[PDB]
């Protein structure tokens, strides 16, 4: 359904999340304490049943899940029969 | 009547993670030596 | 001021035993294994259920020669 | 090799270590031995473990029904201590265990106050004896 | 995958074969070529 024959030349690399990052030598702030000293405002997971018109949890989870399934090609070749 | 809330207790260290236990300590989790009867 | 030669390396004559006593290793190893992140050595797997004797106390802590400290010796 | 020294102590350095043929005390000794090898325990700690290990209720008062001065016979000790080194895989050639454990005892038999030891020098501690004067050592 | 490389019961199986079977049909396992020399290694050596 809704098919065209499309050429997609470049897909970005795998979203395994682990890629050797860009290396530097010097850094801007030479002050590592800032890492341990930093606080933030609280993240509250829930307020009052967590209702939203944009359904955020469901929708975002599924959207991540989709390209994840795409890249693993549905995890369908990896598991044999134990 | 306990005005300190367990909801907010702690100190953000920024990036530093620490572990917490849902219930008991993980070592106490699998009891199989008394269950499957391996003991002297 | 002259002193006996090896006083620099002189052992603590009261407390040098504590470090080696079986109960200490039982407790320490006990809360180490409890972590889940340490593979228990086998001696622990054993004395886990046969913990050592209670009331054997050194002579260093109790200053009594006449106290018969050990059921064994 | 220090293992043999340890076992010599468990055999000869302890008055009345119960009946050493019984599977209970035997297992104590076995486990502690395998823990002196593979460095999991200090010799001192394993020794104090052995002598403080759980044996039987009212131990001394059952000991009054066998022993006068609380010194048991040393055969069970040596037979068990050789047995453990054989059943654990300690040596490549089987006999060596028994031979060494035996030999080291025989040499100490001639020494003044042979089966007593100063508690500091008996095992690993900060300050030690020179390798000739160490107790069940091969160099004596 | 670590059980088959070391023929476990090899000396027994060898004995059974040599005594009860004709030499025309028998398979004999050799311990020398087996991983530890067909033996159980000395204690602290084998990494466990
Ligand atoms: Mg002066
Ligand atoms: Mg000086």
UniProtKB/TrEMBL annotation, chain B:
Annotated organism of origin: Trypanosoma brucei brucei (strain 927/4 GUTat10.1)
UniProt protein name: Small ribosomal subunit protein uS5 C-terminal domain-containing protein
From TrEMBL, chain C:
Species this protein is from: Trypanosoma brucei brucei (strain 927/4 GUTat10.1)
Protein name, per record: Uncharacterized protein
Part of the whole protein covered: 9 to 81 of 312
Transmembrane parts of this sequence: none
Top-rank taxon: Eukaryota
UniProtKB/TrEMBL annotation, chain D:
Highest taxon above the source species: Eukaryota
CC terms in the record's Gene Ontology section: mitochondrial small ribosomal subunit
Protein name per its UniProtKB record: Uncharacterized protein
Section covered of the full-length record: 117 to 256 of 307
TrEMBL record, chain E:
Domain of life according to the entry: Eukaryota
Transmembrane segment boundaries: none
Taxonomic source organism: Trypanosoma brucei brucei (strain 927/4 GUTat10.1)
Protein name as annotated: Uncharacterized protein
């Amino acid at each position: 359904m809704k098919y065209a024959d499309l050429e997609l030349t470049t897909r970005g690399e795998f979203p395994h999340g682990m890629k050797e990052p860009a290396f530097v030598k010097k850094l801007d702030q030479n002050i590592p304490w800032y890492f341990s000293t930093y606080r933030s405002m609280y993240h509250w997971p829930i307020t009052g049943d967590n209702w939203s018109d944009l359904n955020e949890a469901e929708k975002h989870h599924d959207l991540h899940m989709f390209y994840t399934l795409a890249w693993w090609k549905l995890g369908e070749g990896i598991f044999g029969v134990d | 009547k306990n005005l300190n809330s367990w909801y907010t207790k702690g100190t953000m260290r920024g990036g530093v993670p620490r572990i917490y236990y849902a219930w008991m300590r993980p070592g106490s989790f699998t009891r199989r030596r008394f269950e499957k009867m391996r003991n002297p | 001021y002259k002193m006996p030669k090896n006083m620099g390396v002189a052992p603590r004559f009261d407390t040098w035993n504590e470090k080696y006593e079986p109960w200490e290793h039982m407790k320490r190893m006990g809360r180490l294994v409890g972590t889940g992140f340490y593979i228990p050595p086998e001696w622990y797997n054993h004395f886990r259920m046969f913990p050592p004797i209670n009331h054997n106390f050194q002579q260093e802590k109790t200053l009594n020669p006449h106290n018969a400290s050990e059921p064994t010796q | 090799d220090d293992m043999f020294i340890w076992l010599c102590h468990t055999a000869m350095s302890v008055l009345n270590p119960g009946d050493m043929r019984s599977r209970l005390i035997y297992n104590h000794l076995r486990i502690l031995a395998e823990s002196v090898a593979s460095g999991e325990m200090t010799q001192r700690t394993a020794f104090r473990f052995f002598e403080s290990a759980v044996r039987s209720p009212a131990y001394r008062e059952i000991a009054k029904r066998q022993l006068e001065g609380g010194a048991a016979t040393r055969l069970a000790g040596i037979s068990a201590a050789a047995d453990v080194m054989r059943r654990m895989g300690l040596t490549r050639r089987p006999m060596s265990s028994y031979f060494e454990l035996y030999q080291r005892i025989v040499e100490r038999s001639e020494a003044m106050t042979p089966w007593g030891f100063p508690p500091l020098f008996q095992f690993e501690e900060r300050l030690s004896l020179e390798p000739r004067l160490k107790f069940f050592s091969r160099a004596s | 995958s670590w059980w088959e490389p070391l023929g476990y019961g090899w000396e027994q199986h060898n004995e059974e074969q040599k005594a009860l079977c004709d030499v025309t049909e028998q398979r004999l396992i050799d311990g020398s070529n087996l991983p530890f020399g067909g033996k159980l290694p000395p204690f602290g050596t084998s990494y466990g």
